[PDB]
């Protein structure tokens, strides 16, 4: 369970997709995530939090997270909601 664990992080993004789309503010977790993610989709997601809604922006933000191959990106998730202090931090099963 070395890389397999991070392999989990990816499938996990897909797994708590609904809990993400609902509780995630894509304008917030993006701050922690953008440290691993690229501005192009980061800024797009920020546009859709507006145009479509936070949920849709989050939905867009998930698919984008999956494209990143950092170590930190799925941790930016829990890290984000610890920083915002949101519920999602608890149910998300990432490092620490």
From Swiss-Prot:
Post-translational events: Phosphorylated in resting cells and dephosphorylated in RNA virus-infected cells. Ubiquitinated. 'Lys-63' ubiquitination by RNF135, which occurs after RNA-binding and homodimerization, releases the autoinhibition of the CARD domains by the RLR CTR domain, an essential step in the activation of the RIG-I signaling pathway. Lys-78 is the critical site of ubiquitination for MAVS/IPS1 binding and to induce anti-viral signal transduction. Lys-60, Lys-70 and Lys-78 are shared sites for RNF135-mediated and TRIM4-mediated ubiquitination. Also undergoes 'Lys-48' ubiquitination at Lys-87 by RNF125 that leads to proteasomal degradation.
Tissue and organ distribution: Present in vascular smooth cells (at protein level).
Lineage top rank: taxon: Eukaryota
Cross-link Glycyl lysine isopeptide (Lys-Gly) (interchain with G-Cter in ubiquitin) per UniProt, renumbered positions: 2, 60, 70, 78, 87
Effect of residue 78 to R: Complete loss of ubiquitination. No interaction with MAVS/IPS1. No induction of IFN-beta
Induction: By bacterial lipopolysaccharides (LPS) in endothelial cells. By interferon (IFN).
Residue ranges occupied by any CARD domain in the UniProt entry: 1-78
Cellular compartment(s): Cytoplasm; Cell projection, Ruffle membrane; Cytoplasm, Cytoskeleton; Cell junction, Tight junction
Modified residues (Phosphothreonine): 76
Function: Innate immune receptor that senses cytoplasmic viral nucleic acids and activates a downstream signaling cascade leading to the production of type I interferons and pro-inflammatory cytokines. Forms a ribonucleoprotein complex with viral RNAs on which it homooligomerizes to form filaments. The homooligomerization allows the recruitment of RNF135 an E3 ubiquitin-protein ligase that activates and amplifies the RIG-I-mediated antiviral signaling in an RNA length-dependent manner through ubiquitination-dependent and -independent mechanisms.
Record's subunit section: Monomer; maintained as a monomer in an autoinhibited state. Upon binding of viral RNAs and conformational shift, homooligomerizes and forms filaments on these molecules. Interacts (via tandem CARD domain) with MAVS/IPS1 promoting its filamentation. Interacts with DHX58/LGP2, IKBKE, TBK1 and STING1. Interacts (via CARD domain) with TRIM25 (via SPRY domain). Interacts (double-stranded RNA-bound oligomeric form) with RNF135 (homodimer); involved in RNA length-dependent activation of the RIG-I signaling pathway. Interacts with CYLD.
Comment field on protein domains: The RLR CTR domain controls homooligomerization and interaction with MAVS/IPS1. In the absence of viral infection, the protein is maintained as a monomer in an autoinhibited state with the CARD domains masked through intramolecular interactions with the RLR CTR domain. Upon binding to viral RNA and ubiquitination by RNF135, a conformational change releases the autoinhibition promoting further homooligomerization, interaction of the CARD domains with the adapter protein MAVS/IPS1 and activation of the downstream RIG-I signaling pathway. The helicase domain is responsible for dsRNA recognition.
Similarity annotation: Belongs to the helicase family. RLR subfamily.
Disease: Singleton-Merten syndrome 2: A form of Singleton-Merten syndrome, an autosomal dominant disorder characterized by marked aortic calcification, dental anomalies, osteopenia, acro-osteolysis, and to a lesser extent glaucoma, psoriasis, muscle weakness, and joint laxity. Additional clinical manifestations include particular facial characteristics and abnormal joint and muscle ligaments. SGMRT2 is an atypical form characterized by variable expression of glaucoma, aortic calcification, and skeletal abnormalities, without dental anomalies.
This protein's name: Antiviral innate immune response receptor RIG-I
Record organism: Homo sapiens (Human)
